[PDB]
Amino acid sequence: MKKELYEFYFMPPLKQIEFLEELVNNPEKFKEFFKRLKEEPGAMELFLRNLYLMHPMVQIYFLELLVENPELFKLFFEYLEECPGAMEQFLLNLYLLHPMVQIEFLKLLVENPELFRLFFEYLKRCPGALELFKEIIELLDPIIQKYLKKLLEENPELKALVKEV
Amino acid sequence: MKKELYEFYFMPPLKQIEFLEELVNNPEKFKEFFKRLKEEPGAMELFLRNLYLMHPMVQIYFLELLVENPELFKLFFEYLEECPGAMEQFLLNLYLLHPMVQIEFLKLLVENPELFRLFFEYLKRCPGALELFKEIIELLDPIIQKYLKKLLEENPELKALVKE
Amino acid sequence: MKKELYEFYFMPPLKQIEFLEELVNNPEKFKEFFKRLKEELFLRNLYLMHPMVQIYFLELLVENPELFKLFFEYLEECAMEQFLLNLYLLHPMVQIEFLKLLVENPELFRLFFEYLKRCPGALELFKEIIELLDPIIQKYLKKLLEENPELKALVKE
Amino acid sequence: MKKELYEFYFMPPLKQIEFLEELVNNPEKFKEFFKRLKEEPGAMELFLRNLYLMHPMVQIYFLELLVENPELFKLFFEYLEECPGAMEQFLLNLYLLHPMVQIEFLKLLVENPELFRLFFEYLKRCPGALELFKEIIELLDPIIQKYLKKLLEENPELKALVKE
């Protein structure tokens, strides 16, 4: 994926929405596109950057599809986990996300504790970045910290999974 | 319902305003739209979040149309009360709304005080909700507070009804 | 009148600039059409428009000086508080340029203060806006006040 | 030229990228683009503001083009060196840049440390500027400062280059 990443970024949002749906609806091309970005040096950082510089609803739609297909949230995170720098960009974007996009990613993680448990597990799997996701959550707008605290308090083990160390 | 709402979001804002004006000017389509959202899982919250992520002027014009047609502002917020978590979603948007949109929304509410009281009445009906709004009042830039002060000093009873 | 202001907003930005450019170039269009508004929503729509549209509309007032007076003439007639508030809520680049245009055209700067000095307004209102600012903007504002040593004394007065 | 600069801004964002991609390759147009801006009084400040208000990808891709062609990253900065304030406008933009664009600019400097030192040598040349960039970096978002420190662990040399 040397090029296309910019071309696909400048594809119309309705085509980006449709492309991401077909990519998620069938694991075909899903594995290819993320493997091409995985094998290419740093191209996984660009995709996340492109994905997280895209229109906000394109990012929300991808998160909703990853929840609807939990197996692909595994494969999407499995590629992000191995390649270097891809885990840091995902975290960096979390703070730089629009708070409505933040609350939707936090709402989907709470409703999917298995994906939430997968999300935190991969954070421990990546060298470091434990402090990063910590500081990103601590250094955030207060109502997000309030809302996240209330959602985690509904399931204390999910709260205990946030407490960690 | 995803096709109904998500396409409505991605459609051009001027076409959305055309639909919003058609939905408002016809009160029964307004009733139908929000009654259709109640049975569907979180369709109100989805439609709200879509409305919250839309263009600011569309949100503003939607607020104006609800002011010019008062009964629908009642229906919109009474449907919000019926839908669990909708008022929580609305107050969260007000905190995350662009400060200019917050001022226009506040000015329209103070100008039509019955809509301002009806705004609070449904917030208290929900499990919690009202407590969130009081914390949202704290976290805002000063020009919101100062411009709130100019209007609310001319009618301190509204500022009184806020603390009540 | 609502459609005119909303249609002018939702038009493509390049056409909005071309709409304002000839409207400002022809003095009758800037003088009479703005008088039809007299017969806040336009300011908000302008200040919710694309930054380039806001930048060029402010620059067009510099390119044609007499119409910047008229622009502030009608606003001062009835609205001033809305213009002062929109300044604080303006995008930082839009704000810097507006203050930079006043220093580039000092007669518009004095005219900006003069219309604000009408009634005991902006004596404290425009005072707060300067103090409630991020530091890096103030540095550029202060360094630009050095060019034109004359303007330094007028701001303190 | 003011029509030409505004035509470049309001050109479609994909068009702006294709124009900048070609302009970098051939120096003849590249030198013409900044020579015609420098012969005008203060037009370099205008084009910068235009570039600094363009789409984030347009701003990012222009920096990447200068990174892919390191000699022209010196030239584009050499042309800004001629007039004062354009450096300050470049620094003012860096603070006012979207946080992902500030990271992208710093990340390109980390991936090409020689261009980092190239850009940093220019800052000490302008009056202040090095003092202003000192203020900018210490007044950024915390995670932007945090991730910068992690980039200092990847390149501790840059810490010594900063001390100068």
Numbering used by the authors:
A (entry chain D): 2 to 166
B (entry chain A), D (entry chain C): 2 to 165
C (entry chain B): 2 to 40, 46 to 84, 87 to 165
Question: What did the paper state?
Answer:
Here we describe a systematic approach to generating modular and rigid repeat protein oligomers with coincident C2 to C8 and superhelical symmetry axes that can be readily extended by repeat propagation. From these building blocks, we demonstrate that a wide range of unbounded fibres can be systematically designed by introducing hydrophilic surface patches that force staggering of the monomers; the geometry of such fibres can be precisely tuned by varying the number of repeat units in the monomer and the placement of the hydrophilic patches. All multiplexes follow the naming convention CsHRN_Rr where s is the cyclic symmetry, HR stands for helical repeat, R is the number of repeats in a single chain and N is an index to differentiate between multiplexes of the same symmetry.
We determined the high-resolution structures of five designs from C2 to C6 symmetry by X-ray crystallography, cryogenic electron microscopy (cryoEM) or both. C4HR1_4r was solved at 3.3 Å by X-ray crystallography and ~3.7 Å by cryoEM; the two experimental structures are very close to the design model and to each other (r.m.s.d. values of 1.46 Å and 1.38 Å, respectively) with triangular-shaped repeat monomers with inner cavities lined by phenylalanines.
